[PDB]
Symmetry: C3
Subunit: 138 residues, 3 copies
């Protein structure tokens, strides 16, 4: 099985902060380390496939967003926040080295929820990101 | 003549995908190589020149978006290119001079600049292509 | 006292142009050098401090946005600069300490920070200027 890039690239950006969070400029997903408890929901990624009725929809994370496990990477390319990626509808998906594809072919379209994998309330403040690219599995 | 930078910089981003395009995020201008036929319309650029009553409104593309009097979107790898044609929705007369696309007549013009595929290029490798244009006048 | 980074980073982008102003993009703030008079208002930065009921809300500008107790927008060339004044429309009391703009009183303040031109600089070369500010507290 190999992932074929065929879609747009989405990004989940989260700004971890101390209890005293000062949101300057535009508004984004901001969370204090304290809120980084297990199962804690981060953002959500909207996916929409077209003309994929004979292929398995899949999402591919940047090389710096997965290892052995998905996680958001700090701007320093150091600190990481381990998260779990699952669709809103209870569709069945598989995780294969940075790839998250649907077990059944079809032009699926829904929401992919991002949650904190295990309490990590000690996560250093900063800007974390998680990039995912559309495509199919085959 | 020469182009004088005096305005904002706009960008036309197109994502080329295979027949099975999976849009992660929301939203962009995605198109399958199959749709990359000749005259195929990509995105559109809205232009608004003001105080240009004695000058000629002009648009300047990045050095990596033009060559030999030909405009094209560049891949994120600064390698693959999609040749496109620049033309206003209204049939106004413009001129192309080395990456510069200026209007033949002076005055403050405003409207939409349509971007179309120049010749069928359905073999264009998938990826993220862009076309940057900067506002200014010609002299 | 030192500034502790704890919030998001905002940015004020301005595009100085000549009287002939050609807007190519969808939306991006533009202004001709002529409008760059003293007290001239640029953009505005929204500030939302939360859980800061025992800390002094503060804003920190990039190293290339301040110098000698003076704030300014920097050109894309890291050369030209537009000196501006930072002030809360709440008329609240703030202090400027080497790139840091913090509130004199603790509390989870939330409002608008107005950006105005510091002294007439109508000769400012055209280009893209920016001013980055990061949320956090002072102590």
């Amino acid at each position: 099985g190999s992932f074929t890039p065929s879609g747009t690239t989405g990004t989940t950006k989260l700004t971890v902060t101390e209890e005293c969070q000062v949101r300057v400029g535009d508004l984004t997903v901001a969370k204090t380390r304290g809120q980084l408890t297990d199962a804690a929901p981060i953002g959500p990624v909207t996916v929409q496939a077209l003309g994929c009725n004979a292929r398995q929809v899949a999402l591919k994370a940047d090389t710096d967003n997965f290892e052995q496990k998905f996680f958001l990477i700090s701007d320093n390319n150091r600190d990481k926040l381990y998260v779990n990626i699952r669709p809103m509808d209870n569709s069945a998906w598989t995780t294969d080295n940075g790839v998250f594809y649907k077990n059944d072919v079809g032009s699926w379209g829904g929401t992919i929820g991002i949650y904190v994998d295990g309490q990590q309330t000690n996560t250093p403040p900063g800007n974390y990101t998680l990039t995912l690219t559309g495509g199919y599995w085959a």
